[PDB]
Enzyme design. Sequence first.
Site, PDB file in Angstrom:
ATOM      1  N   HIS A 116       0.961  -1.316  -0.351  1.00 22.05           N
ATOM      2  CA  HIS A 116      -0.026  -0.562  -0.019  1.00 22.05           C
ATOM      3  C   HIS A 116       0.920   0.965   0.015  1.00 22.05           C
ATOM      4  O   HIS A 116       0.726   2.516  -0.240  1.00 22.05           O
ATOM      5  CB  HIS A 116      -0.895  -0.046   1.115  1.00 22.05           C
ATOM      6  CG  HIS A 116      -2.311  -1.048   0.589  1.00 22.05           C
ATOM      7  ND1 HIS A 116      -3.220  -0.813  -0.336  1.00 22.05           N
ATOM      8  CD2 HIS A 116      -2.924  -1.912   1.849  1.00 22.05           C
ATOM      9  CE1 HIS A 116      -4.115  -1.715  -0.579  1.00 22.05           C
ATOM     10  NE2 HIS A 116      -3.649  -2.506   1.014  1.00 22.05           N
ATOM     11  N   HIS A 120      -6.289  -7.330  -0.805  1.00 24.92           N
ATOM     12  CA  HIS A 120      -6.414  -5.449  -1.309  1.00 24.92           C
ATOM     13  C   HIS A 120      -5.755  -5.130  -2.622  1.00 24.92           C
ATOM     14  O   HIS A 120      -4.653  -5.671  -2.486  1.00 24.92           O
ATOM     15  CB  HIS A 120      -6.381  -4.530  -0.213  1.00 24.92           C
ATOM     16  CG  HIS A 120      -7.178  -4.554   0.921  1.00 24.92           C
ATOM     17  ND1 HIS A 120      -6.536  -5.178   1.971  1.00 24.92           N
ATOM     18  CD2 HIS A 120      -8.246  -4.058   1.360  1.00 24.92           C
ATOM     19  CE1 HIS A 120      -7.612  -4.859   2.803  1.00 24.92           C
ATOM     20  NE2 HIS A 120      -9.021  -4.187   2.932  1.00 24.92           N
ATOM     21  N   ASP A 128      -5.332 -11.918   3.037  1.00 23.89           N
ATOM     22  CA  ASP A 128      -6.672 -11.836   3.666  1.00 23.89           C
ATOM     23  C   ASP A 128      -7.811 -12.137   3.477  1.00 23.89           C
ATOM     24  O   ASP A 128      -9.210 -11.363   3.001  1.00 23.89           O
ATOM     25  CB  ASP A 128      -6.778 -10.018   3.912  1.00 23.89           C
ATOM     26  CG  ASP A 128      -5.666  -9.545   2.512  1.00 23.89           C
ATOM     27  OD1 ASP A 128      -5.915 -10.336   1.956  1.00 23.89           O
ATOM     28  OD2 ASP A 128      -5.307  -7.498   3.551  1.00 23.89           O
ATOM     29  N   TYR A 137      -5.470 -11.525   8.774  1.00 27.32           N
ATOM     30  CA  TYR A 137      -5.553 -10.932   9.905  1.00 27.32           C
ATOM     31  C   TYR A 137      -6.729 -11.638  10.627  1.00 27.32           C
ATOM     32  O   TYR A 137      -6.983 -11.810  11.348  1.00 27.32           O
ATOM     33  CB  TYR A 137      -5.842  -9.869   9.857  1.00 27.32           C
ATOM     34  CG  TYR A 137      -5.563  -8.528   9.039  1.00 27.32           C
ATOM     35  CD1 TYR A 137      -4.755  -7.880   9.430  1.00 27.32           C
ATOM     36  CD2 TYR A 137      -6.562  -7.814   8.108  1.00 27.32           C
ATOM     37  CE1 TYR A 137      -3.422  -7.126   9.122  1.00 27.32           C
ATOM     38  CE2 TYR A 137      -5.303  -7.046   7.337  1.00 27.32           C
ATOM     39  CZ  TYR A 137      -4.362  -6.851   7.394  1.00 27.32           C
ATOM     40  OH  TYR A 137      -3.758  -6.003   6.364  1.00 27.32           O
TER      41      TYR A 137
HETATM   42  K   LIG Z   1      -4.333  -7.339  -4.449  1.00 29.97           K
HETATM   43 ZN   LIG Z   2      -4.951  -6.447   2.771  1.00 27.62          ZN
END
Ligand SMILES: [K+]
Ligand SMILES: [Zn+2]
Length: 357
Positions: free
Chosen positions: A133, A173, A264, A304
């Site tokens: 990120h 993500h 995740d 997580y």
């Molecule tokens: K990804």
């Molecule tokens: Zn993630």
Amino acid sequence: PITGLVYDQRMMLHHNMWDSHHPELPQRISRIFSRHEELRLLSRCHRIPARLATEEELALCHSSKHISIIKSSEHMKPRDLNRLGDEYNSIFISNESYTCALLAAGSCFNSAQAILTGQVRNAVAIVRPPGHHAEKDTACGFCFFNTAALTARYAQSITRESLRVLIVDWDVHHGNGTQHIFEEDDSVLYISLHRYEDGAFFPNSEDANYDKVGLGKGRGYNVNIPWNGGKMGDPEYMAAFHHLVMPIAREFAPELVLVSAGFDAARGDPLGGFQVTPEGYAHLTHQLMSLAAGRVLIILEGGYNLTSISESMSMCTSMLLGDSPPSLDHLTPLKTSATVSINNVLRAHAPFWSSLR
Ligand SMILES: [K+]
Ligand SMILES: [Zn+2]
Ligand SMILES: [K+]
């Protein structure tokens, strides 16, 4: 055929001094490491040492400003730490955060070095904080520096600048940082599978959509596989890997595979909402092992549910060690939304990739 493993307890020092139950827990790496012991996988691996990344190495992807700001947080009082952390999208900072981010990157540098020099064939990197990120000039989503992105540049720095490294991001993500850093690069192929929900899912940007295929000489070397409206699982990911990831990756012919391996998207994750199984991650791992002469580095990102990620990543290490893939659950037909997503990416990358048509 030997598999490397790097882990350092010191990376647990990174903590949230307000929300001690913040999902990005220190015990994330602890539990994964512990699970490797119980399954007796740790002894089967060659232990790769951790180290601090240098500011010189951080500069491979990050601005002078960003490095100095995070470097300063080390000597800050909590009120200033609170202050600084609040300036970012979803970031908590402690006095040990800077050092921990350094240790995460440095650990992955040594692992890449071990792989590229032929000491190990492949490796796993049990590290935190995550990295994908993080942008060039800012921190984001629990990430300070983009570990996987930095590892790609380090890898090239000790071989040649044009070393073709593939980054597969199966964290639930989108790795906004990783995409942006290499968006104009044809030497680093970035493939990401992520929950999109038309941009409603973190990091809430339309940069994660399938139509963003790269810029300049990097056109076609950025592949976004977005998921919309649905609890995606093993069938959808196996289908995406079969139709998109693997054929694109084979045509690219990487010399090094980096896995931004967030877990995740795993079943039971508190944030993901998806249901990829540990068996699923194993097959994905095993599938990637057929690339770059087996030179695969698996890097921990998100994930997580302490039990989910422990089981999931251990299964990946088991695959790197040469063990046989467990049988997947009976494979449900694809969720209608998946086929839509897969076809869009197909259409958006068919011109740049011959194996897609
Ligand atoms: K990804
Ligand atoms: Zn993630
Ligand atoms: K790229």
